Amino acid sequence: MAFASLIERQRIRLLLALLFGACGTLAFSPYDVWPAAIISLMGLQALTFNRRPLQSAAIGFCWGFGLFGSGINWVYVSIATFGGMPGPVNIFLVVLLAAYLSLYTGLFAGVLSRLWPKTTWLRVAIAAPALWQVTEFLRGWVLTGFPWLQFGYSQIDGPLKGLAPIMGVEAINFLLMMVSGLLALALVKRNWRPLVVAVVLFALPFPLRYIQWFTPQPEKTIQVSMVQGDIPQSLKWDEGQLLNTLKIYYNATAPLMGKSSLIIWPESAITDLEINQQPFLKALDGELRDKGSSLVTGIVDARLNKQNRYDTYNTIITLGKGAPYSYESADRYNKNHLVPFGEFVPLSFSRGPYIQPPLSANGIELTAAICYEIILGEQVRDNFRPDTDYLLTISNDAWFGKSIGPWQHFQMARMRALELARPLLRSTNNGITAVIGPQGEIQAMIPQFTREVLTTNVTPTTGLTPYARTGNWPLWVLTALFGFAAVLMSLR
């Protein structure tokens, strides 16, 4: 046989693209193999060499489909269990989602091989990172976006973690696409120059991780007790289980009063309207103030708005010491970035303001996010303020079941703590509830899929990271400069 007549064939290239896309899903939290991201990106860029724009677009689409048919398949658990659509219909829906998410990768590959047909360093090192940044922005922006499975999140424990506090996780996405292509440039061509360049560009951010952009405050250390109720997702929105859920949470929280300064309940812990459960909240706030503590809990609130029609918000509310409860109080967080097909129909929860004040609780200012909102770095940074002590996130991962989705969500949550240099207090109904340190490090974690309480001492951090001080625009300026240079050098 032969091994040179097979690679040149297009069908073999499509199969290899599928294989590399599938293998790239091993780079995230359930498996935590950061070399898999590099290998997958190297395969993506190397298989598109010497290809026509249409063929390369097809190869990129196949690579994206391989990535998104295995990296995100837990969505099946969110459809088969919760929904009357039969098994084949759920499979078709998952396939449609994977194809839609791979359309952006196909577009990226097609544009890359149209504007930059020849395999040179200008393509792998200059054009590919900028075009990948633009494509990922489009994927995370169009139709409310879905910026899931970004290889920058795979470097939390990797060498390039310290680049996140300076320029943001997407900057890692810029570098991983930049380095891997150079490796690809050293693989197809027997030239050690791209290998040396990639090694240098990968080993430079490694010393840039011992820098602490935060100052710990060993005088405001408080005991936080996050409650994981493990309420089943099948009966959560039932009137018969409303009383049982309240009893479970209250009996889990009552011993914690007087010993934990802050108590946190998961997203939509009170599965009832905020106006309906007024006496319970008032009595709870009175008891919390008597013992001395603050409770931050998720709830669904109905507001008559200005047109006298109800506006439904998925809110986080605060009660107790340092934050008295009232139905009309600014100490509240309304979820802004709703989950498509889970809370609204694109093309019915309402959207809160994009910028909201941080929650105040017993003298502690919390930057709050809800479930899906924690994966959006830009929104969290915009809501972040210098006075913030901890990053607050409440979620409900029971939809995804016993799958890889919860861990990917947890890793994307840890990336926010790494970027903003603030402790992250993640609470979930049955998912991963943890206290992520200022460097994206797990300081505490309780077993998943059980009814437990995570009670640990946590220390605030002050100071601003370069990312939290300038934002995401330096990365966009670098991307624009690289794209302009690559385009201007392509007109010849």
Swiss-Prot record:
The active site is formed by E267, K335, C371
InterPro entries on file: Apolipo_AcylTrfase, C-N_Hydrolase, C-N_Hydrolase_sf, LNT_N
List its EC numbers.
Answer: 2.3.1.269
Q: Which residues cross the membrane?
A: 10-27, 34-48, 53-68, 87-116, 121-141, 169-189, 192-210, 472-492
GO BP of this protein: lipoprotein biosynthetic process
Substitution effect: E373A: Loss of activity
Domain named CN hydrolase: which ranges?
Answer: 227-460
Question: Molecular function terms in GO for this entry?
Answer: N-acyltransferase activity
- Keywords on record: Acyltransferase, Cell inner membrane, Cell membrane, Membrane, Transferase, Transmembrane, Transmembrane helix
Q: Which Pfam families match?
A: CN_hydrolase, LNT_N
Q: What class of enzyme is it?
A: transferase
Write down the superkingdom of origin: Bacteria
Q: Part of which pathway?
A: Protein modification; lipoprotein biosynthesis (N-acyl transfer)
Phenotype of the disrupted gene, per the record: Essential. Depletion induces juxtapositioning of inner and outer membranes and alters the architecture of the cell envelope. It causes mislocalization of outer membrane lipoproteins. The mutant has a copper-sensitive, temperature sensitive phenotype.
Record has Ligase as a keyword = no
* Side of membrane Cytoplasmic, spans: 1-9, 49-52, 117-120, 190-191
Q: How does it sit in the membrane?
A: Multi-pass membrane protein
Q: What is its main location?
A: membrane
| GO CC terms in record | outer membrane-bounded periplasmic space; plasma membrane
Localisation per UniProt entry: Cell inner membrane
Quaternary arrangement and interactors, per the entry? Answer: Monomer.
Q: Mind telling me which PANTHER family this protein's record contains?
A: APOLIPOPROTEIN N-ACYLTRANSFERASE
Q: Which HAMAP family match?
A: Lnt
Q: What does this protein do?
A: Catalyzes the phospholipid dependent N-acylation of the N-terminal cysteine of apolipoprotein, the last step in lipoprotein maturation. Utilizes a two-step reaction via a ping-pong mechanism. Lnt undergoes covalent modification in the presence of phospholipids, resulting in a thioester acyl-enzyme intermediate. It then transfers the acyl chain to the amine group of the N-terminal diacylglyceryl-modified cysteine of apolipoprotein, leading to the formation of mature triacylated lipoprotein.
Protein name as it appears in the record: Apolipoprotein N-acyltransferase
